[PDB]
């Protein structure tokens, strides 16, 4: 298991909160709460070791040319595929707005 931190340029704080998912094997939960303006802070706890650059790529693509709301995002992952991860993150961002 490791704990990873990411940070990205963001806009104004999102203003709702959301929880999506579950820490079942092959799945993850995502907590999304309003953050500090201009900044998106992401914490990932994952069962899969050595996956930092994978998570980096995932977020890079997700936020490519589109400034998300400034949020605090806490992720607890039990080995979800990048596909499942992406889908849940999009589900989370959907609810927050």
């Amino acid at each position: 298991m490791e704990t990873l931190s990411f940070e990205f340029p963001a806009g104004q704080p999102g203003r709702g909160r959301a929880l999506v998912g579950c820490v079942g094997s092959g799945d993850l939960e995502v907590l999304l709460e309003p953050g500090q303006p201009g900044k998106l802070s992401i914490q990932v706890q994952t069962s899969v070791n050595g996956s930092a650059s994978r998570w980096q790529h995932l977020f890079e693509r997700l936020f490519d040319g589109q400034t998300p709301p400034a949020l605090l995002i806490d992720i607890h992952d039990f080995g979800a595929t990048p596909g499942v991860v992406r889908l849940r993150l999009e589900q989370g961002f959907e609810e927050i707005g």
Partner: protein
Amino acid sequence: ASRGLAWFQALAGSLAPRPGDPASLRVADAELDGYPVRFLAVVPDPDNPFPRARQGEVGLLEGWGLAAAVDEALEADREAPRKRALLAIVDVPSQAYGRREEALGIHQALAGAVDAYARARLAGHPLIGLLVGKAMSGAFLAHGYQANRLIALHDPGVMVHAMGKAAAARITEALAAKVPPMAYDIDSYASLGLLWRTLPVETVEVPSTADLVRVRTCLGEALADILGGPRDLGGRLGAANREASARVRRLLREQW
């Protein structure tokens, strides 16, 4: 005097207009991360030879002047190892409204600007539009809207639209929050997928030291994101709210 003026000075240091330019234009060459850059900003000239273009509007001299400044960089860099970046600092309240303007063909002058910019972008110059305030109508078309990448300051004073709130409401308050293409706020505009980034600042009228650090870093990343990639404006077709723009192009090639 204007957000555009403040930000040109904050970014270029220079502040006196070049001899040869209209007094409504600020141009300065420099570097960004060691990459050659030319700043361009339209700003108010209360002594404008044209009376209707004295509160920051893009009029005859602004359009043709921009054309000339951009053509200057385009020609100077025709063989240079690196085509210089063009950073349009956008803060234009509108097109100039007047008899001189129409009689002398203000539409044609604004075209000169657009033509220069677009020719620069096609030739490999990276264009970045930095929206620090108003970006209205044909003024924005002539100054800014041809950019590879658009960046807006996330501030209520930053506004993109085709006409002023007064004019819209008179030919008709902000019920337009129902319809994203009709709204004035930068968040709505962002939702159209037309901005590469938005960034909130500390003190929008006079950028702080921490603001300049973020903005310059952002411009650096935009520059990097441009270089070596497609020179067109296809990056503006990604959002759900512009679904129909993307679908039309798909349908056009199927039938072409």
